[PDB]
Design an enzyme around this catalytic site. Structure first.
Site, PDB file in Angstrom:
ATOM      1  CD  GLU A   1      40.768  48.679  86.724  1.00 13.39           C
ATOM      2  OE1 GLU A   1      40.134  49.247  87.635  1.00 13.39           O
ATOM      3  OE2 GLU A   1      40.771  47.440  86.563  1.00 13.39           O
TER       4      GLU A   1
ATOM      5  N   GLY B   1      47.854  77.568  67.992  1.00  9.13           N
ATOM      6  CA  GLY B   1      46.774  77.321  67.056  1.00  9.13           C
ATOM      7  C   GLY B   1      46.697  75.877  66.603  1.00  9.13           C
TER       8      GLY B   1
HETATM    9  N1  LIG Z   1      56.170  71.760  78.097  1.00 10.93           N
HETATM   10  C1  LIG Z   1      56.430  72.294  76.911  1.00 10.93           C
HETATM   11  N2  LIG Z   1      55.605  73.270  76.392  1.00 10.93           N
HETATM   12  C2  LIG Z   1      55.870  73.816  75.183  1.00 10.93           C
HETATM   13  C3  LIG Z   1      56.970  73.395  74.457  1.00 10.93           C
HETATM   14  N3  LIG Z   1      57.005  74.089  73.304  1.00 10.93           N
HETATM   15  C4  LIG Z   1      55.951  74.931  73.274  1.00 10.93           C
HETATM   16  N4  LIG Z   1      55.252  74.790  74.442  1.00 10.93           N
HETATM   17  C5  LIG Z   1      54.016  75.508  74.787  1.00 10.93           C
HETATM   18  O1  LIG Z   1      53.278  75.730  73.607  1.00 10.93           O
HETATM   19  C6  LIG Z   1      52.559  76.935  73.691  1.00 10.93           C
HETATM   20  C7  LIG Z   1      52.416  77.543  72.300  1.00 10.93           C
HETATM   21  O2  LIG Z   1      52.166  76.541  71.337  1.00 10.93           O
HETATM   22  P1  LIG Z   1      53.356  75.885  70.473  1.00 10.93           P
HETATM   23  O3  LIG Z   1      53.393  74.398  70.709  1.00 10.93           O
HETATM   24  O4  LIG Z   1      54.676  76.525  70.820  1.00 10.93           O
HETATM   25  O5  LIG Z   1      52.986  76.173  68.939  1.00 10.93           O
HETATM   26  P2  LIG Z   1      51.759  75.369  68.300  1.00 10.93           P
HETATM   27  O6  LIG Z   1      50.915  74.756  69.384  1.00 10.93           O
HETATM   28  O7  LIG Z   1      52.275  74.308  67.370  1.00 10.93           O
HETATM   29  O8  LIG Z   1      50.961  76.470  67.446  1.00 10.93           O
HETATM   30  P3  LIG Z   1      51.649  77.270  66.237  1.00 10.93           P
HETATM   31  O9  LIG Z   1      52.675  78.256  66.757  1.00 10.93           O
HETATM   32  O10 LIG Z   1      50.570  78.010  65.493  1.00 10.93           O
HETATM   33  O11 LIG Z   1      52.304  76.272  65.323  1.00 10.93           O
HETATM   34  C8  LIG Z   1      53.361  77.815  74.629  1.00 10.93           C
HETATM   35  O12 LIG Z   1      52.495  78.412  75.561  1.00 10.93           O
HETATM   36  C9  LIG Z   1      54.315  76.884  75.346  1.00 10.93           C
HETATM   37  O13 LIG Z   1      54.043  76.900  76.724  1.00 10.93           O
HETATM   38  C10 LIG Z   1      57.798  72.415  74.975  1.00 10.93           C
HETATM   39  O14 LIG Z   1      58.776  72.039  74.342  1.00 10.93           O
HETATM   40  N5  LIG Z   1      57.526  71.865  76.205  1.00 10.93           N
END
Ligand SMILES: Nc1nc2c(ncn2[C@@H]2O[C@H](COP(=O)(O)OP(=O)(O)OP(=O)(O)O)[C@@H](O)[C@H]2O)c(=O)[nH]1
Ligand SMILES: Nc1nc2c(ncn2[C@@H]2O[C@H](COP(=O)(O)OP(=O)(O)O)[C@@H](O)[C@H]2O)c(=O)[nH]1
Ligand SMILES: Nc1nc2c(ncn2[C@@H]2O[C@H](COP(=O)(O)OP(=O)(O)O)[C@@H](O)[C@H]2O)c(=O)[nH]1
Ligand SMILES: [Mg+2]
Lengths: 50, 409, 410, 50, 426
Positions: B226, B116
């Site tokens: 670019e 979110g």
């Molecule tokens: N590549 C990578 N993807 C991540 C990582 N942490 C979370 N994700 C991706 O983030 C998606 C979910 O969103 P999150 O970043 O975990 O949480 P958010 O975007 O802050 O949203 P909220 O939970 O509401 O706070 C998941 O589908 C994961 O694939 C990370 O450390 N590395």
């Protein structure tokens, strides 16, 4: 099974993986050879003219 | 010349926590980064891990923005209810970061669209940045959810509702999945049990390889403006497959003979793409090749010739000169505890094709199935949305599918 | 006395010119003949660097022979083009070209009798091609009666750097056909092939290519800087090679060129220079001259040579290849001799051939241009900046009627 | 899944199959004609010299 | 003045020529670095026949090395006098023929001989008045036989009014290295009968017996055989490089020695050839030179002329000698052994004298005899060829590469009519 059979016959029909590049590069080199030969023939004719 | 980086969400600032570690370890060339950053999130848990971490004194205390409570995998909550109180504080800081700057190339945003915060207030931040600056580039490196590997349930709702703004706000959008990166670490890095940390380390490698042209002097430099011309043939088609080579361990690297010809090849096989899609189904519209380190223009020139003469992959009928090369002198740096060995030279390829048209079509069914029975819709509607924007975001992706099919012909 | 001022535009132009001022400074240094003819290129060099990315200017001051330019002549923007001809010709040019015109006017009036201006640039990049193109136009309406030289590299499909090369090449030649007095067409494909075949290098970086282009540029202006048995300045060669006012795109070759492994196994005589000079594999353009005819040809020689050998050898190369020359012009070859060779040699030569095989490249680019422009790829990055649709149609029309007059005269 | 994998390989194999190069074979044919023309042109000129 | 370019094909051709340029350079006083260090003016005045001054006393040989394997070319530049050749003259393939005459004449020839001809054309126009061309090759190999064969045919079509020599070793049943020697020999000779101006038949048997009995060597490596062959080749061209009482160019010998246009295969000898135990016990006179010259065992081909009759014979003498001894010796060796010489030509021996000996010897000679005994070799290989061809052994690399059945039948027919016309003219 039918798709596997079609794969094998198409695989035999391509005549190998490296086949396309060799035929392509051979005809290109052939282009160059005729160009070279044509120049020497022109030179002889023009020399004859003078 | 400087470029500032914004990081949103749990995924955004963890990617940044690895990206900035690489920047400090790599470094007048520093002027473009030294940090000109902003972390922001709704949950304080991950930001305050930085506040007490090893890089306590490195970041100015105000920089690390943190809300009061999370959006909780809710695009509407993170875009309408909770975003409205934190986004104003964030962008009213980023402005004075730009006023500190003089020759701003652009902004670059890191977010994951499944969540979110990464999705909701990502788009909200983007909309006020586009109306405030307009002309300045904003590179968005987003993380889309994988087809079969998945952590959430409502992420189709988020991914469609986020994309509807990612079209007309960002300038250059790079897709990155998790399954594809998991496969990369399993196949090439032979790491059978990877975690998020390893993923974020090699994501930083890609970012560093495309900004090294600004930082260090090369044989053929390339700015952020670019990429704006050389890879997007239409104003609404900017979605880029990414790849990198050589992704290789510490022992295998010495055994193999890394050169320019084979890594130009390795950067083109679908076994090394950062997005789970098969470009054999698609046709390349344009390719961009960043070469770092020990590169003479001849062998990069010879390598693009062999790609063009192969028939395993095809180009659109429009571009005979379907490439954009770029060469920089300084080799890629390594991080202690990292898994990538030191290499004389590396290649980061950013392409554009019609294979991306498959991922949207694949995405459509999952969103379509849930929406038809009105699953989970009551959460988003009570947050402040309606049935209107669900259906209208749906038809926007339908238009995009026809668009890719039309241009690909 | 007779004066040549130098202008370098873009990354390509700046690095070529840096090597160019190395070889000219080294050429003018024991002998008192070197001191009498340095007004043509010196007052500090009579040069003006011009770009939009500070890395190239810093790279110029870093290398050797980088502290000899006057810092006031580093006229220079800050934002950058981005391989956008519209940016290089309408937006960024509009505020930097006024400044370049100030400095160019100061460097022109500093001397007494101008011979001409000398521009080195590219045709694929934005800030090199487009801005240098606009610069050429501003110069033509102020100084119409002075000479003009443009060493321009043309892109090839085999050396394809950027994606929008045809969009820039076509527009750039649309201005060259009216503005420049004459041009010497170059490319990277022929240069790379030359360093493979004749020079036999394994790692030909840009330093070598820029060194080759520099040798040509030094060779064309030797007649002004040194006494010779038969002098030919820039204006003399122009009238002897250009039969019609728009037919002024030349192909260039330099001799002698031998690998360092065979430098001591070879002879250096005028017949030996002529065999390598007329060699189709020795042109610095990707236009095989045996695919057409020669309108005219010119050979500039340096070194103590017997003029009789020069004239009889040129007559021979015209008698033997008698089909490759135009019919309504007998004795198609102009020649000149100067007595001072370049440093490190005894006897050198420079070939400039105005052939009709050059129409292959112009046609060779148009099909790429028509390929993109048919379905409007990459067009908005040019359109939304100030250009309209009729500009591409005009550029295409001039390309088509140009290859027609070569085809006509062929 | 395995059917889709096999199908892609067949499509790749069909793409690779060497295909006749019309724009190049005709060039070769035209080059030989000019070559033969110059041979006959040469014999008349040699006759003239004797 | 008159110029001869040198063309070496295959491994045998390349190594033969390497020793050739060493021996020649020693005769003219050029050190291995390629500079002049001689004393007499007679050495500087006639180096335009074989060299070109490059820049500052740099004399480079007028030679062209051509083959299909890198090992031979590297073995040339490694040894001394290896740094004197111009590197552009190393026309050079990579794949190889594999002792397959078709691969040397149809498969690999099509992509190399054009490049070879460019270098050869450059060396012909680099000189003013060509005397001829000089080709050293074998007849049993593939890259020497086929590659050199097609080169000879194309050259005769370009420069037809010019002389041409081919120094060729031929295979024999006792020294049999390759298995397909007859297939290569009969087809190669089938081309030599209609292309070469005159050919010099060599073979390895004679070379082995010269080093056994005459030279009395213990370990005769190929360096010594090539040393022997080089002395003969230098002898045939000494007339162009040094003045004498009776000069004889290449054209003079060919027009005088070849009575019928297809019968131009020669047998060669060389004198003096003496062992280190007997180099002190000998004299140096014209008759002593003549008997060791006309000796049957001293022929550099394993075809005994005393099985047949001599058609014509030639002698090239080098050193300060009296022409009366030259003429009277040829007359005496023809009068005693009168049956061994053909009858309908009187004075079947042409002789010439040159006033410059080889370095280290007071007086030498070189014999070139066109006898009729050479038909033995053609039959000796013809029956082996027919024996193989009547069951199509080893044929699929021939017929699968481009030859048909009529080519081998053409080869037999031309083989059979040549041995039949030798039999008539004897
Ligand atoms: N590549 C990578 N993807 C991540 C990582 N942490 C979370 N994700 C991706 O983030 C998606 C979910 O969103 P999150 O970043 O975990 O949480 P958010 O975007 O802050 O949203 P909220 O939970 O509401 O706070 C998941 O589908 C994961 O694939 C990370 O450390 N590395
Ligand atoms: N010979 C040579 N060519 C160069 C050099 N640098 C760039 N180029 C050519 O210039 C073209 C790109 O020019 P570009 O840098 O975009 O020009 P600019 O952006 O207007 O300054 C490429 O096709 C290169 O081949 C150089 O140092 N030497
Ligand atoms: N005199 C001499 N003959 C050789 C030498 N090497 C090989 N031969 C002969 O060459 C024949 C085989 O030919 P080959 O060398 O394979 O010829 P190529 O492959 O065409 O170069 C054998 O009959 C050998 O007698 C050498 O160094 N000296
Ligand atoms: Mg979160």
């Amino acid at each position: 099974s039918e798709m596997g059979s079609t794969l094998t016959t198409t695989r035999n029909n391509m005549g190998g993986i490296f086949s396309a590049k060799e035929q392509s590069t051979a005809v290109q080199k052939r282009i160059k050879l005729l160009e070279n030969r044509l120049e020497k023939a022109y030179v002889k004719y023009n020399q004859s003219i003078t | 010349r400087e470029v500032i980086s914004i990081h949103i969400g749990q995924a955004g600032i963890q990617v940044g926590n690895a990206c900035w570690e690489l920047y400090c370890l790599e470094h007048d060339a520093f002027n473009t980064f030294f940090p000109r950053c902003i972390f922001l999130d709704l949950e304080p848990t991950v930001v305050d891990e930085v506040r007490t971490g090893t890089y306590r004194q490195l970041f100015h205390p105000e920089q690390l923005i943190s809300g009061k409570e999370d959006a909780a995998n809710n695009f509407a909550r993170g875009h309408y209810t909770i975003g409205k109180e934190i986004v104003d504080l964030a962008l009213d800081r980023i402005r004075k970061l730009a006023d500190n700057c003089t020759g701003l190339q652009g902004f670059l945003v890191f977010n994951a669209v499944g969540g979110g915060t990464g999705s909701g207030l990502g788009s909200l931040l983007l909309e006020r940045l586009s109306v405030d600056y307009g002309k300045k580039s904003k590179l968005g490196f987003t993380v889309y959810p994988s087809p079969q590997v998945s952590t959430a349930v409502v992420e189709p709702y988020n991914s469609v509702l986020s994309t509807h703004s990612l079209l007309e706000h960002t300038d250059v959008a790079v897709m990155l999945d998790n399954e594809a990166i998991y496969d990369i670490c399993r196949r090439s890095l032979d790491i059978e049990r990877p975690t998020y940390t390893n993923l974020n380390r090699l994501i930083a490698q890609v970012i560093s390889s495309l900004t090294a042209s600004l930082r260090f002097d090369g044989a053929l430099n390339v700015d952020i403006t670019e990429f704006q011309t050389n890879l997007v043939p239409y104003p609404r088609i900017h979605f880029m497959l990414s790849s990198y080579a050589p992704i290789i361990s510490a022992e295998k690297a010495y055994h193999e003979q890394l050169s320019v010809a084979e890594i130009t090849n390795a950067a083109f096989e679908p076994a090394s793409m950062m997005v789970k899609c098969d470009p054999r189904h698609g046709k390349y519209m344009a390719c961009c090749l960043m070469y770092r380190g020990d590169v003479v223009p001849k062998d990069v020139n010879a390598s693009v010739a062999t790609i063009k003469t192969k028939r395993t992959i095809q180009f659109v009928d429009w571009c005979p000169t379907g490439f954009k090369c770029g060469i920089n002198y300084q080799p890629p740096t390594v991080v202690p505890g990292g898994d990538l060995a030191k290499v004389q030279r590396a290649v980061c390829m950013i392409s554009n094709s019609t294979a991306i048209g498959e991922i949207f079509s694949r995405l459509d069914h999952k969103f379509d199935l849930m929406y038809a029975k009105r699953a989970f819709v009551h959460w988003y509607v009570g947050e402040g949305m309606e049935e209107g924007e669900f259906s209208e975001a749906r038809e926007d992706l339908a238009a995009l599918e026809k668009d890719f099919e039309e241009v690909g012909a | 006395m007779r004066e040549i001022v130098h202008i370098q535009g873009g990354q390509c132009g700046n690095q070529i010119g840096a090597k160019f001022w190395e070889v000219v400074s080294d050429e003018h240094g024991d002998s008192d003949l070197q001191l009498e003819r340095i007004n043509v290129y010196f007052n500090v060099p009579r040069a003006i660097l011009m770009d939009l990315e500070p890395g190239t200017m810093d790279s110029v001051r870093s290398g050797p022979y980088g502290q000899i330019f006057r810092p006031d002549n580093f006229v220079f923007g800050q934002t950058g083009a981005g391989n956008n001809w519209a940016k290089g010709h309408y937006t960024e040019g509009a505020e930097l070209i006024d400044s370049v015109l100030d400095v160019v006017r100061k460097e022109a009036e500093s001397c007494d009798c101008l011979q001409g201006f000398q521009v080195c640039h590219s045709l694929g990049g934005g800030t090199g091609s487009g801005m240098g193109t606009l610069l050429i136009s501003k110069i033509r309406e102020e100084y119409p009666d002075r000479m003009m030289l443009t060493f321009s590299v043309v892109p090839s499909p085999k050396v394809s750097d950027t994606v929008v090369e045809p969009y820039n090449a076509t527009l750039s030649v649309h201005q060259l056909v009216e503005n420049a007095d004459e041009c010497m067409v170059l490319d990277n494909e022929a240069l790379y092939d030359i360093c493979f075949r004749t020079l036999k290098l394994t790692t030909p970086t840009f330093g070598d290519l820029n060194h080759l282009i520099s040798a040509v540029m030094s060779g064309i202006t030797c007649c002004l800087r040194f006494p010779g048995q038969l002098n030919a300045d820039l204006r003399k060669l122009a009238v002897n090679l250009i039969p019609f006012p728009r037919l002024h795109f030349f192909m260039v070759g330099f001799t002698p060129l031998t690998s360092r492994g065979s430098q001591q196994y070879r002879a250096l005589t005028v017949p030996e220079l002529t065999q390598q000079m007329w060699d189709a594999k020795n042109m610095m353009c990707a236009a095989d001259p045996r695919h057409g005819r020669y309108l005219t040809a010119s050979a500039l020689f340096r070194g103590r040579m017997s003029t009789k050998e020069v004239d009889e050898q040129m007559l021979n190369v015209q008698n033997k290849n008698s089909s490759y020359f135009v019919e309504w012009i007998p004795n198609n070859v102009k020649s000149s001799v100067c007595d001072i060779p370049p440093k490190g040699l005894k006897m050198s030569a420079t070939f400039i051939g105005n052939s009709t095989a050059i129409q292959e490249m112009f046609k060779r680019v148009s099909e790429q241009f028509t390929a993109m422009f048919r379905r409007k790829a990459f067009l908005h990055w040019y359109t939304g900046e100030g250009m309209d649709e009729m500009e591409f149609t005009e550029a295409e029309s001039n390309m088509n009627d140009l290859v027609s007059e070569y085809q006509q005269y062929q | 899944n395995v059917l889709n994998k096999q199908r892609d390989d067949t499509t790749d194999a069909s793409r690779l199959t060497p295909g006749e190069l019309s724009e190049e074979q005709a060039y070769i044919q035209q080059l030989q004609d000019e070559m033969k023309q110059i041979d006959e042109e040469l014999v008349e000129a040699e006759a003239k010299n004797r």
